[PDB]
Write a protein that binds this ligand. Structure first.
Ligand SMILES: *[C@@H]1O[C@H](CO[C@@H]2O[C@@H](C)[C@@H](O)[C@@H](O)[C@@H]2O)[C@@H](O[C@@H]2O[C@H](CO)[C@@H](O[C@@H]3O[C@H](CO[C@H]4O[C@H](CO)[C@@H](O)[C@H](O)[C@@H]4O[C@@H]4O[C@H](CO)[C@@H](O)[C@H](O)[C@H]4NC(C)=O)[C@@H](O)[C@H](O[C@H]4O[C@H](CO)[C@@H](O)[C@H](O)[C@@H]4O[C@@H]4O[C@H](CO)[C@@H](O)[C@H](O)[C@H]4NC(C)=O)[C@@H]3O)[C@H](O)[C@H]2NC(C)=O)[C@H](O)[C@H]1NC(C)=O
Lengths: 190, 209
């Protein structure tokens, strides 16, 4: 039983990150990029009541994003192929939404980042404030909208005082269809 | 293997509204032509009941029978965590198949329902987003609806419940409307039904101020 995993969307969209294709078994590994075999992989030695072998292949950001195919050959040998999710790009629209008046009775409040109209669904979202990450968020998986694009929401939970004091919070979105693969929107008390 | 059994719970909305009709559904697929007879026995907290409604077997395209038994449940019984058991008997089985279902367990928490107007920035578009945030709820079983002037809205999508940091769930429901409808002061209403709400129902409305 072989399972081939794609890079995380954020890794492909940030040059500083290292996108990887993972070939998981639950052994000779042969890796192919558009048919052409490559010797780049890092196979770790075979580590409950069963065995597991893992090979990891580092990919070039642009190659992954331009749709090159990545073939893991677990050596009848099981051969598998992966590449970027297909579809014509649609640029995300990003909107920040303050907490409801009625949430102000609570100790913590909800800062909302709506991301809609994007295609395909490979996307990353982060928050920051004052030059540091704000990690107390949950982001919904992308969901198919009625027009065939995706949407999601990210919810940053923040101490109510931090919001009342006027701190500016920022929702950062990364997607292949954005200019520079990045955009940001900010939100503060108004 | 031979025949297999699937047990479906009632819809959350059906359990929460006393006028509606919550049902547990027991489905048997892959019943052979050779041994086509099926018996359902139904149990509520391990006590056999005899009021289920069983339909005659139906021939499928793949030359197998499908047989369905439906048990109507008492709303409060389901909400009070009673266990519903379907036992399926068939001569093609090494032993009868038993399956049990009940409401997700765990301390209930009341959903908080907030409506959020469109971003000012979205106002440059032809269509606008109305957001209903529902958070702090347990269990995840929930129904959410958008309406205007007592009439259902045709363009909305609700995210599946997502686990929050404290073990409760949240979701968002996005309503898309023509910008003019928002501009002309129309009232839009997000209704939520959940076991931990008073009367299992709450509605929150918003309009351009
Ligand atoms: C012969 O044909 C019949 C009929 O085939 C049907 O028509 C033909 C023309 C084709 O198009 C088929 O694709 C089509 O299905 C076949 O019968 C099917 O058999 C399979 C099993 O092999 C059943 O699969 C199960 O499906 C349920 C969900 O079922 C709903 O959704 C279906 C499609 O979306 C729909 O067709 C069904 O009617 C049903 O709809 C629901 O019905 C209820 C009752 O009326 C209703 O109230 C609901 O509102 C309604 N739902 C919707 C969305 O409208 C799925 O949940 C099952 O998944 C479990 O089992 C899998 C293994 O079988 C497993 O991989 C999953 O992970 C999951 O496992 C369970 O997981 C939970 C934890 O979450 C755990 O608690 C359990 O222990 C665990 N394991 C279990 C339960 O074993 C499953 O996929 C089809 O329902 C069934 N179709 C019908 C109509 O009954 C038959 O297989 C064919 N035979 C051959 C040899 O080919």
């Amino acid at each position: 039983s072989v399972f081939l995993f794609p890079p995380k969307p954020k890794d492909t969209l940030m040059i500083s990150r290292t996108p990887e294709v993972t070939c998981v078994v639950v052994v000779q590994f042969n890796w192919y990029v558009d048919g052409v075999e490559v010797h780049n992989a890092k196979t770790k030695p075979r580590e409950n009541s069963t065995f597991r072998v893992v090979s990891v292949l580092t990919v070039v950001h642009q190659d992954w994003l331009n749709g090159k195919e990545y073939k893991c050959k677990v050596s009848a040998p099981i051969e598998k192929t992966i590449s970027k999710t297909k579809g014509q790009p649609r640029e995300p629209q990003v909107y920040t939404l303050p907490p409801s008046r009625e949430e102000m009775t609570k100790n913590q409040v909800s800062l909302t980042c709506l991301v809609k109209g994007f295609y395909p669904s490979d996307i990353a979202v982060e928050w920051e404030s004052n030059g540091q990450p704000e990690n107390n968020y949950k982001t919904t998986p992308p969901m198919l909208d009625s027009d065939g694009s995706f949407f999601l929401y990210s919810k940053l939970t923040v101490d109510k005082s931090r919001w009342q004091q006027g701190n500016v919070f920022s929702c950062s979105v990364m997607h292949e269809a954005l200019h520079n693969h990045y955009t940001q929107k900010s939100l503060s008390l108004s």
